[PDB]
């Protein structure tokens, strides 16, 4: 089993998953003086149906909000993509304290948390399971979360956590459009990368928003009060789940702006 402890964490993942030392690993530090503006990048277009929201689940190291993905009711288009990508999940990463928590960094600056909105290429593949290992299979929007004022748009998510406190618990999570969590501007960086935890597939086209969203210190505390243990065991809070940034290995981060 992999995790984020010193024994099973990011620094040891390569033992079980050798791709952890690959050439397209995520997250990365975005150095803005080295980004390349691309005039061929179109605007990001998201159109999500709130009826596709399905379920929230404690997965031990984090929690996931999953969506019905049987059709194109909820899609991401534009940016670097010619294909439509179907929403299937969003989740967060956070750190042990406010000073860190994001996965991507910008000019070395660490933010308090990071939102990931994940999609799969339904123009080319028939399912998430098929798409997840293909180089053009996944598209994930990352939004950096800067500690400050409480973010009211997180409210439904935060209010749901008390029903999935321990590992494996799950509950209906319906009628929610996660485009309400995105920043007002969708100016972005993009680069070819990977899942940020095992199985670390190098299948993700990343879309990192330039604008951050807010989160309060107490809202972050609610994430960290989720438990990684199963019901009845000694409580083990989910203190953190962000991977360190990884070498670019010659990749180009492109800017839409
Ligand atoms: N933090 S993140 O990079 O946004 C991020 C991290 C992890 C995920 N999870 C997945 O992608 N699960 C797909 C796994 N499907 C089973 C499977 C697929 C292929 C295969 F060969 C064997 C089994 C999503 C986003
Ligand atoms: Zn993630």
PDB file of C-alpha atoms and ligand atoms in Angstrom:
ATOM      1  CA  UNK A   1       0.000   0.000   0.000  1.00  0.00           C
ATOM      2  CA  UNK A   2       1.115   3.522  -0.867  1.00  0.00           C
ATOM      3  CA  UNK A   3       0.395   6.604   1.177  1.00  0.00           C
ATOM      4  CA  UNK A   4       1.904   9.888   2.290  1.00  0.00           C
ATOM      5  CA  UNK A   5       3.791   8.676   5.387  1.00  0.00           C
ATOM      6  CA  UNK A   6       7.583   8.672   5.504  1.00  0.00           C
ATOM      7  CA  UNK A   7       7.559   4.894   4.907  1.00  0.00           C
ATOM      8  CA  UNK A   8       5.029   4.592   2.047  1.00  0.00           C
ATOM      9  CA  UNK A   9       5.031   8.161   0.742  1.00  0.00           C
ATOM     10  CA  UNK A  10       6.099  10.053  -2.375  1.00  0.00           C
ATOM     11  CA  UNK A  11       9.706   9.549  -1.953  1.00  0.00           C
ATOM     12  CA  UNK A  12       9.358   5.789  -1.843  1.00  0.00           C
ATOM     13  CA  UNK A  13       6.665   5.382  -4.536  1.00  0.00           C
ATOM     14  CA  UNK A  14       9.203   4.401  -7.203  1.00  0.00           C
ATOM     15  CA  UNK A  15       9.787   1.012  -5.532  1.00  0.00           C
ATOM     16  CA  UNK A  16       6.257  -0.122  -6.415  1.00  0.00           C
ATOM     17  CA  UNK A  17       5.687   2.331  -9.312  1.00  0.00           C
ATOM     18  CA  UNK A  18       8.850   2.913 -11.369  1.00  0.00           C
ATOM     19  CA  UNK A  19       7.094   5.544 -13.511  1.00  0.00           C
ATOM     20  CA  UNK A  20       7.412   7.814 -10.435  1.00  0.00           C
ATOM     21  CA  UNK A  21      10.853   8.682 -11.861  1.00  0.00           C
ATOM     22  CA  UNK A  22       9.494   9.200 -15.388  1.00  0.00           C
ATOM     23  CA  UNK A  23       9.794  12.103 -17.811  1.00  0.00           C
ATOM     24  CA  UNK A  24       6.190  13.361 -17.539  1.00  0.00           C
ATOM     25  CA  UNK A  25       5.571  13.382 -13.791  1.00  0.00           C
ATOM     26  CA  UNK A  26       3.286  15.805 -11.944  1.00  0.00           C
ATOM     27  CA  UNK A  27       3.053  18.185 -10.173  1.00  0.00           C
ATOM     28  CA  UNK A  28       5.672  20.695 -11.317  1.00  0.00           C
ATOM     29  CA  UNK A  29       6.857  24.145 -10.344  1.00  0.00           C
ATOM     30  CA  UNK A  30       5.671  26.618 -12.976  1.00  0.00           C
ATOM     31  CA  UNK A  31       8.456  29.154 -13.640  1.00  0.00           C
ATOM     32  CA  UNK A  32       6.687  32.035 -15.359  1.00  0.00           C
ATOM     33  CA  UNK A  33       9.801  33.416 -17.066  1.00  0.00           C
ATOM     34  CA  UNK A  34      10.163  30.054 -18.843  1.00  0.00           C
ATOM     35  CA  UNK A  35       6.544  29.650 -19.936  1.00  0.00           C
ATOM     36  CA  UNK A  36       5.752  29.897 -23.640  1.00  0.00           C
ATOM     37  CA  UNK A  37       2.661  31.819 -24.663  1.00  0.00           C
ATOM     38  CA  UNK A  38       0.739  29.883 -27.314  1.00  0.00           C
ATOM     39  CA  UNK A  39      -1.660  31.828 -29.534  1.00  0.00           C
ATOM     40  CA  UNK A  40      -3.209  28.543 -30.731  1.00  0.00           C
ATOM     41  CA  UNK A  41      -4.591  27.803 -27.245  1.00  0.00           C
ATOM     42  CA  UNK A  42      -8.338  28.439 -27.248  1.00  0.00           C
ATOM     43  CA  UNK A  43     -10.295  29.428 -24.130  1.00  0.00           C
ATOM     44  CA  UNK A  44     -11.265  26.704 -21.683  1.00  0.00           C
ATOM     45  CA  UNK A  45     -14.967  25.868 -21.932  1.00  0.00           C
ATOM     46  CA  UNK A  46     -16.661  23.846 -19.178  1.00  0.00           C
ATOM     47  CA  UNK A  47     -20.340  22.912 -19.247  1.00  0.00           C
ATOM     48  CA  UNK A  48     -21.363  20.681 -16.339  1.00  0.00           C
ATOM     49  CA  UNK A  49     -24.833  19.317 -15.580  1.00  0.00           C
ATOM     50  CA  UNK A  50     -25.554  19.351 -11.808  1.00  0.00           C
ATOM     51  CA  UNK A  51     -27.602  16.165 -12.265  1.00  0.00           C
ATOM     52  CA  UNK A  52     -24.392  14.211 -12.982  1.00  0.00           C
ATOM     53  CA  UNK A  53     -23.170  14.602  -9.379  1.00  0.00           C
ATOM     54  CA  UNK A  54     -23.281  11.125  -7.828  1.00  0.00           C
ATOM     55  CA  UNK A  55     -21.368  10.226  -4.679  1.00  0.00           C
ATOM     56  CA  UNK A  56     -18.756  11.370  -2.161  1.00  0.00           C
ATOM     57  CA  UNK A  57     -16.294   8.794  -0.831  1.00  0.00           C
ATOM     58  CA  UNK A  58     -13.555   8.618   1.786  1.00  0.00           C
ATOM     59  CA  UNK A  59     -10.671   6.886  -0.006  1.00  0.00           C
ATOM     60  CA  UNK A  60      -8.373   6.833   3.030  1.00  0.00           C
ATOM     61  CA  UNK A  61      -5.780   9.306   1.770  1.00  0.00           C
ATOM     62  CA  UNK A  62      -8.337  11.834   0.519  1.00  0.00           C
ATOM     63  CA  UNK A  63     -11.999  12.118  -0.445  1.00  0.00           C
ATOM     64  CA  UNK A  64     -13.509  12.085  -3.928  1.00  0.00           C
ATOM     65  CA  UNK A  65     -16.711  13.514  -5.390  1.00  0.00           C
ATOM     66  CA  UNK A  66     -17.654  11.314  -8.331  1.00  0.00           C
ATOM     67  CA  UNK A  67     -19.956  12.025 -11.266  1.00  0.00           C
ATOM     68  CA  UNK A  68     -22.085   9.956 -13.611  1.00  0.00           C
ATOM     69  CA  UNK A  69     -20.031   9.633 -16.790  1.00  0.00           C
ATOM     70  CA  UNK A  70     -22.307   7.628 -19.093  1.00  0.00           C
ATOM     71  CA  UNK A  71     -22.841  10.542 -21.523  1.00  0.00           C
ATOM     72  CA  UNK A  72     -21.682  14.061 -22.409  1.00  0.00           C
ATOM     73  CA  UNK A  73     -23.884  16.012 -19.996  1.00  0.00           C
ATOM     74  CA  UNK A  74     -20.737  17.368 -18.278  1.00  0.00           C
ATOM     75  CA  UNK A  75     -17.806  18.186 -20.548  1.00  0.00           C
ATOM     76  CA  UNK A  76     -14.601  20.194 -20.833  1.00  0.00           C
ATOM     77  CA  UNK A  77     -13.654  21.593 -24.257  1.00  0.00           C
ATOM     78  CA  UNK A  78     -11.235  24.107 -25.730  1.00  0.00           C
ATOM     79  CA  UNK A  79      -7.785  24.971 -24.450  1.00  0.00           C
ATOM     80  CA  UNK A  80      -5.256  22.652 -26.085  1.00  0.00           C
ATOM     81  CA  UNK A  81      -7.923  20.041 -26.857  1.00  0.00           C
ATOM     82  CA  UNK A  82      -9.642  19.054 -30.063  1.00  0.00           C
ATOM     83  CA  UNK A  83     -11.568  16.297 -28.262  1.00  0.00           C
ATOM     84  CA  UNK A  84     -14.340  16.670 -25.696  1.00  0.00           C
ATOM     85  CA  UNK A  85     -13.439  15.424 -22.204  1.00  0.00           C
ATOM     86  CA  UNK A  86     -16.076  14.053 -19.825  1.00  0.00           C
ATOM     87  CA  UNK A  87     -16.124  15.072 -16.152  1.00  0.00           C
ATOM     88  CA  UNK A  88     -15.779  12.182 -13.725  1.00  0.00           C
ATOM     89  CA  UNK A  89     -14.460  13.486 -10.400  1.00  0.00           C
ATOM     90  CA  UNK A  90     -13.140  16.391  -8.376  1.00  0.00           C
ATOM     91  CA  UNK A  91     -11.050  16.270  -5.205  1.00  0.00           C
ATOM     92  CA  UNK A  92      -8.580  18.349  -3.192  1.00  0.00           C
ATOM     93  CA  UNK A  93      -5.044  18.133  -1.897  1.00  0.00           C
ATOM     94  CA  UNK A  94      -3.874  19.868   1.266  1.00  0.00           C
ATOM     95  CA  UNK A  95      -0.873  20.031   3.584  1.00  0.00           C
ATOM     96  CA  UNK A  96      -0.030  19.655   7.262  1.00  0.00           C
ATOM     97  CA  UNK A  97      -0.271  23.424   7.805  1.00  0.00           C
ATOM     98  CA  UNK A  98      -1.358  26.478   5.836  1.00  0.00           C
ATOM     99  CA  UNK A  99       2.167  27.205   4.545  1.00  0.00           C
ATOM    100  CA  UNK A 100       1.930  24.327   2.081  1.00  0.00           C
ATOM    101  CA  UNK A 101      -0.749  22.141   0.676  1.00  0.00           C
ATOM    102  CA  UNK A 102      -0.876  22.693  -3.057  1.00  0.00           C
ATOM    103  CA  UNK A 103       0.732  20.252  -5.489  1.00  0.00           C
ATOM    104  CA  UNK A 104       1.677  22.654  -8.250  1.00  0.00           C
ATOM    105  CA  UNK A 105       3.701  25.703  -7.294  1.00  0.00           C
ATOM    106  CA  UNK A 106       4.178  28.949  -9.218  1.00  0.00           C
ATOM    107  CA  UNK A 107       7.636  30.550  -9.134  1.00  0.00           C
ATOM    108  CA  UNK A 108       8.351  28.454  -6.048  1.00  0.00           C
ATOM    109  CA  UNK A 109       5.327  29.736  -4.118  1.00  0.00           C
ATOM    110  CA  UNK A 110       3.328  26.987  -2.290  1.00  0.00           C
ATOM    111  CA  UNK A 111      -0.381  27.523  -1.713  1.00  0.00           C
ATOM    112  CA  UNK A 112      -2.547  26.024   1.035  1.00  0.00           C
ATOM    113  CA  UNK A 113      -4.480  23.484  -1.047  1.00  0.00           C
ATOM    114  CA  UNK A 114      -5.358  22.604  -4.616  1.00  0.00           C
ATOM    115  CA  UNK A 115      -8.583  21.623  -6.362  1.00  0.00           C
ATOM    116  CA  UNK A 116      -8.455  19.007  -9.137  1.00  0.00           C
ATOM    117  CA  UNK A 117     -11.339  18.572 -11.597  1.00  0.00           C
ATOM    118  CA  UNK A 118     -10.736  15.426 -13.639  1.00  0.00           C
ATOM    119  CA  UNK A 119     -12.064  14.413 -17.066  1.00  0.00           C
ATOM    120  CA  UNK A 120     -11.492  11.594 -19.565  1.00  0.00           C
ATOM    121  CA  UNK A 121     -11.319  11.529 -23.358  1.00  0.00           C
ATOM    122  CA  UNK A 122     -14.682  10.155 -24.489  1.00  0.00           C
ATOM    123  CA  UNK A 123     -14.080  11.116 -28.123  1.00  0.00           C
ATOM    124  CA  UNK A 124     -11.338   8.485 -28.362  1.00  0.00           C
ATOM    125  CA  UNK A 125     -12.047   5.942 -25.608  1.00  0.00           C
ATOM    126  CA  UNK A 126     -15.092   4.115 -24.249  1.00  0.00           C
ATOM    127  CA  UNK A 127     -14.468   4.424 -20.499  1.00  0.00           C
ATOM    128  CA  UNK A 128     -12.339   5.947 -17.764  1.00  0.00           C
ATOM    129  CA  UNK A 129     -10.653   2.563 -17.301  1.00  0.00           C
ATOM    130  CA  UNK A 130      -9.535   2.540 -20.945  1.00  0.00           C
ATOM    131  CA  UNK A 131      -8.578   6.224 -21.026  1.00  0.00           C
ATOM    132  CA  UNK A 132      -6.687   6.394 -17.724  1.00  0.00           C
ATOM    133  CA  UNK A 133      -3.440   4.942 -19.139  1.00  0.00           C
ATOM    134  CA  UNK A 134      -3.465   6.705 -22.550  1.00  0.00           C
ATOM    135  CA  UNK A 135      -1.209   9.706 -23.146  1.00  0.00           C
ATOM    136  CA  UNK A 136      -4.211  11.753 -24.334  1.00  0.00           C
ATOM    137  CA  UNK A 137      -6.629  10.038 -21.960  1.00  0.00           C
ATOM    138  CA  UNK A 138      -7.115  12.455 -19.046  1.00  0.00           C
ATOM    139  CA  UNK A 139      -7.548  16.205 -18.572  1.00  0.00           C
ATOM    140  CA  UNK A 140      -7.358  17.706 -15.079  1.00  0.00           C
ATOM    141  CA  UNK A 141      -7.978  21.341 -14.140  1.00  0.00           C
ATOM    142  CA  UNK A 142      -5.918  22.454 -11.143  1.00  0.00           C
ATOM    143  CA  UNK A 143      -6.893  25.511  -9.105  1.00  0.00           C
ATOM    144  CA  UNK A 144      -4.525  26.812  -6.444  1.00  0.00           C
ATOM    145  CA  UNK A 145      -6.251  27.587  -3.139  1.00  0.00           C
ATOM    146  CA  UNK A 146      -4.838  30.532  -1.209  1.00  0.00           C
ATOM    147  CA  UNK A 147      -5.569  30.739   2.505  1.00  0.00           C
ATOM    148  CA  UNK A 148      -7.685  33.765   3.373  1.00  0.00           C
ATOM    149  CA  UNK A 149     -11.426  34.420   3.483  1.00  0.00           C
ATOM    150  CA  UNK A 150     -13.848  31.536   3.844  1.00  0.00           C
ATOM    151  CA  UNK A 151     -15.043  30.290   0.464  1.00  0.00           C
ATOM    152  CA  UNK A 152     -18.849  29.875   0.535  1.00  0.00           C
ATOM    153  CA  UNK A 153     -18.838  27.813  -2.673  1.00  0.00           C
ATOM    154  CA  UNK A 154     -17.192  24.957  -0.743  1.00  0.00           C
ATOM    155  CA  UNK A 155     -20.172  24.738   1.643  1.00  0.00           C
ATOM    156  CA  UNK A 156     -22.000  21.703   0.240  1.00  0.00           C
ATOM    157  CA  UNK A 157     -18.720  19.782   0.050  1.00  0.00           C
ATOM    158  CA  UNK A 158     -17.723  20.654   3.612  1.00  0.00           C
ATOM    159  CA  UNK A 159     -21.181  19.844   4.994  1.00  0.00           C
ATOM    160  CA  UNK A 160     -20.975  16.400   3.393  1.00  0.00           C
ATOM    161  CA  UNK A 161     -17.778  15.301   5.139  1.00  0.00           C
ATOM    162  CA  UNK A 162     -19.440  14.426   8.450  1.00  0.00           C
ATOM    163  CA  UNK A 163     -21.148  11.493   6.687  1.00  0.00           C
ATOM    164  CA  UNK A 164     -17.887  10.024   5.342  1.00  0.00           C
ATOM    165  CA  UNK A 165     -15.569  10.567   8.296  1.00  0.00           C
ATOM    166  CA  UNK A 166     -13.739   7.220   8.054  1.00  0.00           C
ATOM    167  CA  UNK A 167     -12.122   5.232   5.262  1.00  0.00           C
ATOM    168  CA  UNK A 168     -14.544   3.519   2.891  1.00  0.00           C
ATOM    169  CA  UNK A 169     -17.633   5.482   3.882  1.00  0.00           C
ATOM    170  CA  UNK A 170     -19.598   6.901   0.979  1.00  0.00           C
ATOM    171  CA  UNK A 171     -22.787   8.864   0.536  1.00  0.00           C
ATOM    172  CA  UNK A 172     -24.976  10.338  -2.204  1.00  0.00           C
ATOM    173  CA  UNK A 173     -23.787  13.772  -3.321  1.00  0.00           C
ATOM    174  CA  UNK A 174     -26.229  15.160  -5.846  1.00  0.00           C
ATOM    175  CA  UNK A 175     -27.274  18.284  -7.736  1.00  0.00           C
ATOM    176  CA  UNK A 176     -23.909  20.047  -7.735  1.00  0.00           C
ATOM    177  CA  UNK A 177     -22.069  21.851 -10.537  1.00  0.00           C
ATOM    178  CA  UNK A 178     -18.322  22.047  -9.745  1.00  0.00           C
ATOM    179  CA  UNK A 179     -17.754  24.852 -12.277  1.00  0.00           C
ATOM    180  CA  UNK A 180     -19.000  27.015  -9.374  1.00  0.00           C
ATOM    181  CA  UNK A 181     -15.642  26.287  -7.686  1.00  0.00           C
ATOM    182  CA  UNK A 182     -13.507  27.623 -10.549  1.00  0.00           C
ATOM    183  CA  UNK A 183     -11.964  31.116 -10.471  1.00  0.00           C
ATOM    184  CA  UNK A 184     -13.650  33.898 -12.414  1.00  0.00           C
ATOM    185  CA  UNK A 185     -10.868  33.998 -15.023  1.00  0.00           C
ATOM    186  CA  UNK A 186      -9.875  30.773 -16.763  1.00  0.00           C
ATOM    187  CA  UNK A 187      -6.491  31.971 -18.029  1.00  0.00           C
ATOM    188  CA  UNK A 188      -4.310  28.899 -17.700  1.00  0.00           C
ATOM    189  CA  UNK A 189      -1.005  27.110 -18.063  1.00  0.00           C
ATOM    190  CA  UNK A 190      -0.878  23.691 -19.692  1.00  0.00           C
ATOM    191  CA  UNK A 191       1.736  20.940 -19.845  1.00  0.00           C
ATOM    192  CA  UNK A 192       1.764  17.153 -20.383  1.00  0.00           C
ATOM    193  CA  UNK A 193       2.003  15.268 -17.086  1.00  0.00           C
ATOM    194  CA  UNK A 194       0.733  12.522 -14.870  1.00  0.00           C
ATOM    195  CA  UNK A 195      -1.520  11.452 -12.076  1.00  0.00           C
ATOM    196  CA  UNK A 196       0.020  12.898  -8.935  1.00  0.00           C
ATOM    197  CA  UNK A 197      -0.264   9.674  -6.948  1.00  0.00           C
ATOM    198  CA  UNK A 198      -0.173   5.961  -7.798  1.00  0.00           C
ATOM    199  CA  UNK A 199      -0.591   4.573 -10.295  1.00  0.00           C
ATOM    200  CA  UNK A 200       1.112   7.781 -11.568  1.00  0.00           C
ATOM    201  CA  UNK A 201       0.076   7.210 -15.214  1.00  0.00           C
ATOM    202  CA  UNK A 202       1.593   9.770 -17.593  1.00  0.00           C
ATOM    203  CA  UNK A 203      -1.820  10.357 -19.105  1.00  0.00           C
ATOM    204  CA  UNK A 204      -2.832  13.857 -17.927  1.00  0.00           C
ATOM    205  CA  UNK A 205      -2.975  17.091 -19.877  1.00  0.00           C
ATOM    206  CA  UNK A 206      -2.852  19.589 -17.016  1.00  0.00           C
ATOM    207  CA  UNK A 207      -4.769  22.884 -17.051  1.00  0.00           C
ATOM    208  CA  UNK A 208      -3.505  25.085 -14.188  1.00  0.00           C
ATOM    209  CA  UNK A 209      -5.521  28.254 -13.603  1.00  0.00           C
ATOM    210  CA  UNK A 210      -3.561  31.459 -13.162  1.00  0.00           C
ATOM    211  CA  UNK A 211      -6.124  32.875 -10.707  1.00  0.00           C
ATOM    212  CA  UNK A 212      -6.392  31.302  -7.270  1.00  0.00           C
ATOM    213  CA  UNK A 213      -9.524  30.723  -5.193  1.00  0.00           C
ATOM    214  CA  UNK A 214      -9.811  31.322  -1.469  1.00  0.00           C
ATOM    215  CA  UNK A 215     -10.119  28.925   1.466  1.00  0.00           C
ATOM    216  CA  UNK A 216     -10.151  29.723   5.167  1.00  0.00           C
ATOM    217  CA  UNK A 217      -7.881  28.238   7.820  1.00  0.00           C
ATOM    218  CA  UNK A 218     -10.953  26.587   9.379  1.00  0.00           C
ATOM    219  CA  UNK A 219     -12.100  25.107   6.086  1.00  0.00           C
ATOM    220  CA  UNK A 220      -8.664  23.524   5.665  1.00  0.00           C
ATOM    221  CA  UNK A 221      -9.046  22.173   9.202  1.00  0.00           C
ATOM    222  CA  UNK A 222     -12.194  20.354   8.074  1.00  0.00           C
ATOM    223  CA  UNK A 223     -10.205  18.529   5.365  1.00  0.00           C
ATOM    224  CA  UNK A 224      -7.551  17.558   7.920  1.00  0.00           C
ATOM    225  CA  UNK A 225     -10.221  16.264  10.337  1.00  0.00           C
ATOM    226  CA  UNK A 226     -11.171  13.523   7.880  1.00  0.00           C
ATOM    227  CA  UNK A 227      -9.938  10.153   9.144  1.00  0.00           C
ATOM    228  CA  UNK A 228      -7.776   7.673   7.218  1.00  0.00           C
ATOM    229  CA  UNK A 229      -8.658   4.733   9.479  1.00  0.00           C
ATOM    230  CA  UNK A 230     -11.726   2.529   9.235  1.00  0.00           C
ATOM    231  CA  UNK A 231     -14.586   2.974  11.682  1.00  0.00           C
ATOM    232  CA  UNK A 232     -13.717   1.611  15.122  1.00  0.00           C
ATOM    233  CA  UNK A 233      -9.936   1.867  14.824  1.00  0.00           C
ATOM    234  CA  UNK A 234      -7.654   4.475  16.374  1.00  0.00           C
ATOM    235  CA  UNK A 235      -8.413   7.777  14.660  1.00  0.00           C
ATOM    236  CA  UNK A 236      -5.702   8.900  12.231  1.00  0.00           C
ATOM    237  CA  UNK A 237      -6.414  12.346  10.716  1.00  0.00           C
ATOM    238  CA  UNK A 238      -5.605  12.927   7.036  1.00  0.00           C
ATOM    239  CA  UNK A 239      -2.970  15.542   7.747  1.00  0.00           C
ATOM    240  CA  UNK A 240      -1.684  15.920   4.180  1.00  0.00           C
ATOM    241  CA  UNK A 241      -1.754  14.428   0.699  1.00  0.00           C
ATOM    242  CA  UNK A 242       0.268  16.647  -1.647  1.00  0.00           C
ATOM    243  CA  UNK A 243       3.143  15.314  -3.741  1.00  0.00           C
ATOM    244  CA  UNK A 244       6.360  17.350  -4.041  1.00  0.00           C
ATOM    245  CA  UNK A 245       6.972  18.994  -7.394  1.00  0.00           C
ATOM    246  CA  UNK A 246       8.857  16.908  -9.961  1.00  0.00           C
ATOM    247  CA  UNK A 247      11.495  17.637 -12.638  1.00  0.00           C
ATOM    248  CA  UNK A 248      10.213  19.121 -15.888  1.00  0.00           C
ATOM    249  CA  UNK A 249      12.691  16.970 -17.889  1.00  0.00           C
ATOM    250  CA  UNK A 250      12.545  19.253 -20.908  1.00  0.00           C
ATOM    251  CA  UNK A 251       8.780  19.757 -20.983  1.00  0.00           C
ATOM    252  CA  UNK A 252       7.366  23.139 -21.987  1.00  0.00           C
ATOM    253  CA  UNK A 253       4.711  24.835 -19.879  1.00  0.00           C
ATOM    254  CA  UNK A 254       2.515  26.820 -22.265  1.00  0.00           C
ATOM    255  CA  UNK A 255       0.529  29.902 -21.262  1.00  0.00           C
ATOM    256  CA  UNK A 256      -2.862  30.937 -22.629  1.00  0.00           C
ATOM    257  CA  UNK A 257      -2.204  34.557 -21.632  1.00  0.00           C
TER     258      UNK A 257
HETATM  259  N1  LIG B   1      -4.359  13.985  -8.300  1.00  0.00           N
HETATM  260  S1  LIG B   1      -4.852  13.680  -9.888  1.00  0.00           S
HETATM  261  O1  LIG B   1      -3.496  13.572 -10.778  1.00  0.00           O
HETATM  262  O2  LIG B   1      -5.931  14.768 -10.436  1.00  0.00           O
HETATM  263  C1  LIG B   1      -5.625  12.057 -10.016  1.00  0.00           C
HETATM  264  C2  LIG B   1      -5.036  10.980  -9.377  1.00  0.00           C
HETATM  265  C3  LIG B   1      -5.627   9.732  -9.496  1.00  0.00           C
HETATM  266  C4  LIG B   1      -6.783   9.577 -10.247  1.00  0.00           C
HETATM  267  N2  LIG B   1      -7.395   8.260 -10.350  1.00  0.00           N
HETATM  268  C5  LIG B   1      -7.525   7.552 -11.615  1.00  0.00           C
HETATM  269  O3  LIG B   1      -7.124   8.006 -12.634  1.00  0.00           O
HETATM  270  N3  LIG B   1      -8.153   6.246 -11.617  1.00  0.00           N
HETATM  271  C6  LIG B   1      -8.295   5.508 -12.854  1.00  0.00           C
HETATM  272  C7  LIG B   1      -7.946   4.056 -12.554  1.00  0.00           C
HETATM  273  N4  LIG B   1      -8.723   3.151 -13.385  1.00  0.00           N
HETATM  274  C8  LIG B   1      -8.421   1.783 -13.005  1.00  0.00           C
HETATM  275  C9  LIG B   1      -7.298   1.290 -13.903  1.00  0.00           C
HETATM  276  C10 LIG B   1      -6.954   2.042 -15.015  1.00  0.00           C
HETATM  277  C11 LIG B   1      -5.936   1.626 -15.855  1.00  0.00           C
HETATM  278  C12 LIG B   1      -5.264   0.446 -15.576  1.00  0.00           C
HETATM  279  F1  LIG B   1      -4.259   0.029 -16.404  1.00  0.00           F
HETATM  280  C13 LIG B   1      -5.610  -0.305 -14.458  1.00  0.00           C
HETATM  281  C14 LIG B   1      -6.632   0.115 -13.617  1.00  0.00           C
HETATM  282  C15 LIG B   1      -7.367  10.662 -10.878  1.00  0.00           C
HETATM  283  C16 LIG B   1      -6.782  11.916 -10.767  1.00  0.00           C
HETATM  284 ZN1  LIG B   2      -5.374  15.315  -7.420  1.00  0.00          ZN
END
